[PDB]
Symmetry: D2
Subunit: 116 residues, 4 copies
């Protein structure tokens, strides 16, 4: 019953991206970003436990993934400072979100799988 | 001659993404995002002439593509509010940057092609 | 202990792609493709049980995914006849392979996560 | 004037993919793949002049990009043998096709942009 999960893959090595830091924010009434949650990806390239179904209310959310530090650790100079995923959550009721990020040094793709 | 251009494709239609609004910011000394340029893509899904070789100094830049408005205009309710590409530019000297975005309602990818003038 | 798994996602709807047919082949001595396994994706957009670690020997493999029939079922005329993933398997010993395909009507991406 | 072109980008380097070999086939009446055209990408990662508006009749075509040789030449051992794009062309009348491929060692994406002459 985890409603927000993030999965990061490394397209160069073909493996999960481990130890990728990410920060999750929610848009405040004053249109600024308020810190919500944070963590680092597991050995499976995943991050769970960001929030509970109860705390995860309708809102605009941002997931910032520190892709630059990941590549620098591997000795590669990347293009992006980080990867941002910005989205409206739960506007039609509660959903479970899996955000996937696929990383290359000069390119990334992000996809959402949203289920009921 | 143009140091920063953006190309946007539509993965649903198999076509350039037309009339996609974009905003560019540059990070100021104070750590805030200062507006830097804007525009919309043409019939070829491209936006050129955002800045000049002389004005586009070293800095951290953000290109914000209003993908949500793009999809809504087509009657589609997509996942993302927008697509944002944040990068340091010109730190090892001047380069030409092409930012390419490929859009689907629930997914997008972005790639940079960076070449030495 | 499943060594070859395929996961298909729909980038338009943001959901697993369910009931996508796929066929798996291995390159024969006579450089032709020999049928190996087949199936359709589950409600989770996944296909397992294609092979066992014992039967999955070093070889060149092809996974053909019938993306065209999937889109036609949804009333969309797609570009590709199907998506092909062609790769050498197990050349350095046994690995577990997860092949992911992300589908849009005029674009697809494929990624491999290979673990030990 | 050119009805079929291919653009290949390198997602590791942030650059066009140069000297990528490609082979195109067309499905024959007998269900076999008959060789149709070939070439390599230029310095701009593009391959043009594969066929002519007149020769590129309705059919099922396959573009096979030798991504494995590309990566090996760079010292990298990638996952795929090649990238293959199989599609029906010109079934609703003549169109112009651009096949775009974005390459990483363990991932690639391919997109078609199809426009009406
Ligand atoms: O400490 C804030 O962020 C932390 C530092 C930081 C940064 O330096 C640059 C950046 O790209 C992201 C970033 O995330 C950090 C962060 C820390 C957390 O503990 C956290 O829960 C989070 O969501 C994120 C913060 C505080 C704020 O009060 C605030 O309004 C805000 O927008 C942000
Ligand atoms: O009508 C457009 O597509 C069709 C309607 C549609 C939709 O309502 C919601 C959605 O999730 C997907 C979607 O795909 C439809 C579609 C139908 C086709 O026959 C087709 O070949 C195709 O590429 C696609 C269209 C036009 C456009 O001009 C456009 O840019 C675009 O992205 C899409
Ligand atoms: O956003 C600012 O203006 C516009 C409104 C707007 C918005 O409502 C939401 C959003 O996602 C983006 C956004 O971009 C707009 C914008 C317009 C421009 O003409 C422009 O050059 C630009 O950089 C951007 C802005 C930002 C700022 O950070 C700022 O300090 C300021 O004075 C102004
Ligand atoms: O029956 C063969 O394939 C089946 C029909 C078929 C097709 O018509 C077009 C196409 O794109 C793919 C395709 O896969 C089918 C198939 C069926 C299976 O049961 C299977 O295990 C498999 O791998 C795949 C076959 C037999 C052969 O003897 C053979 O050499 C071969 O290459 C293929
Ligand atoms: O040396 C090239 O990259 C570096 C070496 C390398 C490798 O040995 C294996 C691998 O898995 C990835 C890889 O990334 C390296 C890399 C280093 C950088 O500093 C960098 O900015 C970058 O984009 C990347 C190179 C040159 C190229 O000309 C090229 O086309 C290419 O794709 C790559
Ligand atoms: O592959 C044929 O020639 C070349 C060798 C070759 C290969 O070893 C492996 C592979 O992945 C692709 C491949 O393409 C080659 C090829 C060369 C060309 O000049 C060409 O126009 C073409 O379509 C293709 C071929 C295929 C056939 O199906 C065929 O009937 C034939 O007579 C010949």
């Amino acid at each position: 019953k985890c409603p927000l999960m993030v999965k990061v893959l490394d397209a160069v090595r073909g493996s999960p991206a481990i130890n990728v830091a990410m920060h999750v924010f929610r848009k405040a009434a004053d249109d600024t970003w308020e810190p919500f949650a944070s963590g680092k990806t597991s050995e499976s390239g995943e991050l769970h436990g960001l929030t509970t179904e109860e705390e995860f209310v309708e809102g605009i959310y941002k997931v910032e993934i520190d892709t630059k530090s990941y590549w620098k650790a591997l000795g590669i100079s990347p293009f992006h400072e980080h990867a941002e995923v910005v989205f409206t959550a739960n506007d039609s009721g509660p959903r479970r979100y899996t955000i996937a990020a696929l990383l290359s040094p000069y390119s990334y793709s992000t996809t959402a799988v949203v289920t009921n």
